[PDB]
Design a protein around this ligand. Sequence first.
Ligand SMILES: Nc1ncnc2c1ncn2[C@@H]1O[C@H](COP(=O)(O)OP(=O)(O)NP(=O)(O)O)[C@@H](O)[C@H]1O
Ligand SMILES: Nc1ncnc2c1ncn2[C@@H]1O[C@H](COP(=O)(O)OP(=O)(O)NP(=O)(O)O)[C@@H](O)[C@H]1O
Ligand SMILES: [Mg+2]
Ligand SMILES: [Mg+2]
Lengths: 487, 458, 467
Amino acid sequence: DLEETGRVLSIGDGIARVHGLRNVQAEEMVEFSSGLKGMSLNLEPDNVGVVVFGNDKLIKEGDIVKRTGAIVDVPVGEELLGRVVDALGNAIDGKGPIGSKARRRVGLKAPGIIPRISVREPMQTGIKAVDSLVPIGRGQRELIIGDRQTGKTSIAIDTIINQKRFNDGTDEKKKLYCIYVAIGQKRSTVAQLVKRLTDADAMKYTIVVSATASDAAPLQYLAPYSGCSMGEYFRDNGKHALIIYDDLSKQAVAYRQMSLLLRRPPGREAYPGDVFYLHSRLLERAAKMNDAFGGGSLTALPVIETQAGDVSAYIPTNVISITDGQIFLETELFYKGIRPAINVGLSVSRVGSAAQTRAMKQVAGTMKLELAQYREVAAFAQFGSDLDAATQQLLSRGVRLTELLKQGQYSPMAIEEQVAVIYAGVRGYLDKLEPSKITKFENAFLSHVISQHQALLGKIRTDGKISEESDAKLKEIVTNFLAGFEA
Amino acid sequence: TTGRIVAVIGAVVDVQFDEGLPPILNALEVQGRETRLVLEVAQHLGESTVRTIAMDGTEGLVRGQKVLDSGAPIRIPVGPETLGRIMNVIGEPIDERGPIKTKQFAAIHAEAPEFVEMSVEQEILVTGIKVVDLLAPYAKGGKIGLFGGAGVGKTVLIMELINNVAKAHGGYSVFAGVGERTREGNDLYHEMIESGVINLKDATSKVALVYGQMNEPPGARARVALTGLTVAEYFRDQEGQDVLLFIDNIFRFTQAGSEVSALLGRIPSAVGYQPTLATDMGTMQERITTTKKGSITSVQAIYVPADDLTDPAPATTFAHLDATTVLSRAIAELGIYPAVDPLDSTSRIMDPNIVGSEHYDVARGVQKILQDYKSLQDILSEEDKLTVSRARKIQRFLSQPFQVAEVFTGHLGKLVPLKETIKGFQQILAGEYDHLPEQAFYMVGPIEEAVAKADKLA
Amino acid sequence: TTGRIVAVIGAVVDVQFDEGLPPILNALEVQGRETRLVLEVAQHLGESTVRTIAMDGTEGLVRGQKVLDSGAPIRIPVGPETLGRIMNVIGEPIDERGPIKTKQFAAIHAEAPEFVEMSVEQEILVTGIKVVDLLAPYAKGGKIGLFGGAGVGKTVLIMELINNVAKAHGGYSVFAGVGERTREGNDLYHEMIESGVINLKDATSKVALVYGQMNEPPGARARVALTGLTVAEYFRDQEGQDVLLFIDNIFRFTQAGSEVSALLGRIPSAVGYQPTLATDMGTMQERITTTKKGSITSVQAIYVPADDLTDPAPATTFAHLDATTVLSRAIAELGIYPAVDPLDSTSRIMDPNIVGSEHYDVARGVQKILQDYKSLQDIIAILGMDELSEEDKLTVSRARKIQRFLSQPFQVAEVFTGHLGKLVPLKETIKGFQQILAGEYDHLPEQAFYMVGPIEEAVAKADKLAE
Ligand SMILES: Nc1ncnc2c1ncn2[C@@H]1O[C@H](COP(=O)(O)OP(=O)(O)NP(=O)(O)O)[C@@H](O)[C@H]1O
Ligand SMILES: Nc1ncnc2c1ncn2[C@@H]1O[C@H](COP(=O)(O)OP(=O)(O)NP(=O)(O)O)[C@@H](O)[C@H]1O
Ligand SMILES: [Mg+2]
Ligand SMILES: [Mg+2]
C-alpha cells in the first residue's frame, strides 16, 4: 500500500526521504515505525521529504511510514493556565495531564479585514517609557528588538507581571491572559523564567510553551503557531490574550535548517524565499475583534535578536515591516545607565495615542516633545556651557526626563503612579535637582505617595486625569519632599 | 485541459499536462477545495510539466490533484462596480459585500502602451493642494515617491488627493495595498468611509481598493500591484480618464518579487535582490503613463532599506519617479498641515518650459526665501527683516484645510485652483501683505481667506 | 553484521552493508588496521549504504575493506578510574599508563536532562579576579563562557580559574581538550602532577583528562567534547558530588562539523557553516548542566573567528550561558590583562537581590563611567581634552584609573607579565572600585592602578613611582 504508506529511502540530518505515500497532503503529519512523527514538507514526483520530530537514530532506511489521519492541533483552554508545555501542548512540568476539553489547529488563517475594529484598548506594560512613548493597545503587534543581553525578555516579563492587578480585579474586560513562547532557549533559562513568574504570582494566568535548544528543529518551528492557537481561543471567546514569541530569530534559524536540508533554494543569509511569509502568517493572527465577533483580542510581542545592532539584517527587516511598531534596545544605552535601554527616538508605535488612557495622554504628549527638542541639542550637553538660556533649558529639562524613564525590574507601575512621576518632571519641579539623584528620588518619592497619599493616587485614577486640586496637592508633596531629599 | 499536481514545495507547485500546456503567466484553478486556489504558470520545465507560483496557501494539496487551465492569465472585474469595493489579487471581493458585478473582466498581465501611443504632452495634474502644485507639482502619467508614514498625515493626504482629483478632473482612483497589514487595511477602509471617498449606500465611491495582505504568499503580494494597475487601466483606456493609482508600498512589491525569484531557484543578484529587479520594476511602471486616451498617474509610498538611497531597490525605483512628496515629522511638529517638506519635495516638471514662467519664478522665489530664512535663523538689516517676516507667512500659507478632515477638525476644507495658489505666494514675495499679521495665513485656502482671517483678528 | 567501504573522501567514509544496516550514531570498527579506527554513522544514503565520520586518519583505507558494526555508539570508560588518566575521543588511554581498569562504560551520545530536572539555585562563585567578581560574577553550578579571538587570553584565564577554584575543589574535575594545542595539554598534565591534583602512584587524583587536539582529523574534534562531558555526566549522576567541567575550546566542536559539512552533502548556511549548527550545539550544550541529581560548574573557552562575535558559532553560544566573560583584542593590545571587555560581559546573578545592592551599585557605576568615557574618547581625540568641563575631565581621569584597576597579574601569567600573581577577595574588589568612583584617589597617578592586586598596592605604587 504505497498510497497510505511508504518506505524510508534515506535519512539524515532530520530529513527522511520517503518512497510512496502517494495520497499524503502537503504539510501532513505522518508516523514512522519507531513512533516518531514527521511533517511532509516536500512533495516531489519520486519522494516525500519528511522533517523529523525527534532523534533520527530511531529512523533507518526501509522503515515503514504511515498516514494516520493526523491533525496538527494542540490543546486549548483555561486548563493550560499555570502549565509549562512543549511545542505540542504536552505537559513538561511533571504536574500530570492537561485537563483540556478543546483543541485547535496550529496552522490557521488570520481573521481578515472585516471582522476587526481599530485597536483602542490599552495594553499596559507598567513600564513608563513604553506606556508613555511607545503605547501598546490590545490586538497590536509590537516588536521587542535589540542585541543579546539588552533586556528584551525583561520587557516581556514585566508586562506579564503587570497584568496581575487587572486579573485580581473584578473588571472582566481589563483582564489579560498571557502566553510565553520560548524558542531555542536552554531549559535552565526557561526554569529561571518560570520561577520568576511563580514568585510574582503570575503563573496562574500564564501559559508557557517551550521548545528548547535540544528539541528538534520542526518542534521549534511549530512552537509560535501552537502558542498562537492557544491565544486565539481567548481572542475568539470575547477575552484578551497576550503572546510573547521569545524569540523569532531562533524560530527562523530552525526553519532555515529544514529548508536548506530539504534543498530549497538559499537566499540572503541562506534564508528561504518564504521566510517573511513564515512570520507574517504568524503575526497577522494577532488581532482586535469587533463587537459582532465578541470583541476579544490577541496582542503579540515578538522578540528579535539583532547582531551588532544591525536592524537591517534579513529577519529583523521582515519583522520590523510586519509589526505595528518596535521597541529598540541598545547596549550603549544599557551601560550608560539607561535601563530599560529603550531608544525613544527610534522606537515607534503606529497605534499611538489610541492605546492610551486620558491620564497618560495628558502628560505623554508634552514629554514626547520636550525629549524630541532635547534630542536635537543633546550632542553638546557636555560642550554647551556658553550658549543661551533657551538651549540650556532644553538640556536641563531633557536630561531630567531621561532619568524619569529609567526603571528597575520586576516592579511594573500602575498608570496613576506613572503619570504622577512624569508630572513632576514635565511641570519642572525636578529642574534644579542633580540628574544622578533622580532615580533615588523617584524610588523614595513613589514609596511615599503610595504609602501615605493613596487618596491622591485614587483621585488621579478616579478622575482619569490630574485635576487642579490634584495638581495643587502634588506640587506641595513634590516641592517639600525634594527639599528634604537634597539636604 | 486538466492537469495533475506532481510536486508541492511550499508556495511552488508543479503541474503536468497530457495535451496542451498552459503558457507562462496563465492562471490555473486547483480543483477539489474550499476556497479558490490560483496558480500562476512561471516556467515550462520540460516533459509536459509547468512550474507555478501559488496565490494562496498550499497546505492540504495532494500529488495527482486536478488542476484546470483557465486559458488566460489572472482575470479580474473591471469597471465602475469596483469603486468602493475591496478585491484581492485574483479579483475576489474581500469586503463581504457580495459579487463585484462588472460587465467586463481583464487580464492582470498586459503589455505597456506601445511607442506610438505615447503622449509627448508634459502636463501638470492639479491636486488643489498648495505645497504640491506650486513647489513639487504632479505630472499627468508620472510617478510620485511618497516619503514618510506614521503620524505625518499620509492617509489623510491620500484621501484628499482622491477627493480633489475626482472633484476637479472627474478622475477616479485605485488604491493597491502591496503587503498590506490587515489591521491597517481595516483602518484605511473605515477612514475612507468616514471621509466619504467610499460610499456604501450609493454609486458615488471614488476609489477601488485592491489588497495583497502581508500573510499571503510571495506570488500574491508580487502580483497585486498588477491587479490594481488593471483596474486603473480600465478607467484610462475605456473611459478616457486621468486616473490616480496609489501603490503602498513599492518596496514590498520589490520584496515580493525577490521572494518569488528565490522560491523559483533563481540565483540572487547584488544585495540578495532578484536578478530581474529592473525588468520586474519596468514592466509594471511603464504601464503607468499618459496615452492618447488618458493617463494613469501614480503616488508610490517608498520605503528605503537601511536608509541607503543607493540600495538597489530604491535606486531602481527612483529611475521611474518624476516627483517626490516628502512628509516630515519636523513640519508636523510645527503644526503645518499637510506636513509636506517644501524644500525636500521636488518635481522634474518644475521647469519654465513645462509650467508657467510665473509658476517657475514664484516657486524658485518661495524656495529661495525659505532657504534664506533657515540661513538667517543662525544670526538683522531692513532688507533681511523684511524677508524673515515674509517667509514665515509663506510657511503658514503652505498649510491648508482638507475636505477629508472636515468631520474631525470641524473646519471647512479647501481645494485651491493653480492660479490662485501662484498669485497668493507671489503677492507675499512682492510684499502686498507685509501690513498684515502672521497667524492670519495659517490654515486658509486662497489668499482672500487670509485677508478675511486678518479682519477677524482685529 | 559486516560492511565494506565504498568511498573515502577525507574524514568521510561510505560503507555498504548487505544485511542489517547500522543505525545513525553507531560505532563501526574498520578491520585490518594497526590501531583501532572507529567510524560513526551519520546518514543512511539509501541503497544499503551509510555515510560515516572517521575518528582517526583515513590514510591507507581501501574500497572493499571490511567494517564491523559494534551494535552501539562510541562507548567509553567512566567512573573513579578515569581520574588522573588521559583518554582520547574513543576512550583509549593516551598517557602510556596501561588500561583504564574500569568495568563501567557509557555511550558518548545521550539525551539531555528534561525540564523537570532543572535546578534554579544560583550562588556566587568568587574567583578572586577583580573584573569577573565585580561586573559579571560566576555562579556555582552555572554555565560559564569565555569568549575571545585568537591570542586574547581565553586559555590563560581558564588556567587561572583552574588555579584559583579547581586546585582547592573538594569534588571532581574534568578537563576536555577540544581542538587545541597539544603543547598546552602537556603543560597542564605536568602542572597537575606537580600540584598533586593528579597523582601517579596513589588513588587521590581529582581530575579526569580527555584530549583530541588540533593534530586530529575533524571526526575526533567533533566528538571529543561529548567524550569529556560523558565522563562528567557520570560524576554528576552516579557519584552525585560537585563537578567542575573545563572545556578548551568548545568552538572546535562546531568547526569540526563545518569541516565535514559539504562532504556530508549539505548546502551551506551563512559564513560556510552547517545548516544544523544550532540544533547540533543544542543537543550537546543541554547535557552540560547542573540537575537535581548533581552540580556541574562548567567553564567553556569559546573561540571567536576573525574577532567577530556575530560569527554564527559564538553568536549561537551566548544563549547557552549564565555568565559570559568576553575578551577583546582592542583591550589586550593596550596591555590591559586580563583583556575582559567590561561593557560586554554579563551574568544572571548581577542582580541587586542576589549580590546585594552595594556590589550591584558599584558594578553599574563602573560600567556607566566606562561607557561614558568610551562615548567621549573619539570626540576629545579631535577637539581636545581642554574643551571638557572639570566634571567631564574628572570622569575621564577616573575612568582611566578604573580601566587600569580592572587589570590584574595572574599567577599563571607570571612568565608574561613579570609580576607576581595576585588574588583579590570580593570585599576588597568592591571597596577599591567604590573608592575610585568616590574620587578618593583623584590625586594619584593613573599608572599606580595598572597591574596590581588590591587597592593598597595602587597606593603603595604611587609612592614608589614618586621616588
Ligand atoms: N529595567 C532593568 N533594570 C536593571 N536591569 C535590567 C533591566 N532589564 C533587564 N535587566 C538585566 O539585564 C540583563 C539582560 O536582560 P534580559 O531580559 O535577559 O535581556 P535579553 O536581551 O532578553 N538577554 P538574552 O536573551 O540572554 O540575549 C539581565 O541580567 C537583567 O536582569
Ligand atoms: N592574563 C594575562 N596576563 C598577561 N598576558 C596574557 C594574559 N592572557 C593572555 N596573555 C598573553 O597573550 C597570549 C595568548 O593568551 P591565550 O590565553 O593563550 O589566548 P587564547 O585566547 O586562548 N587564543 P587561541 O587559543 O589561539 O584561540 C598569552 O600567551 C600571553 O602572552
Ligand atoms: Mg532573552
Ligand atoms: Mg587558547
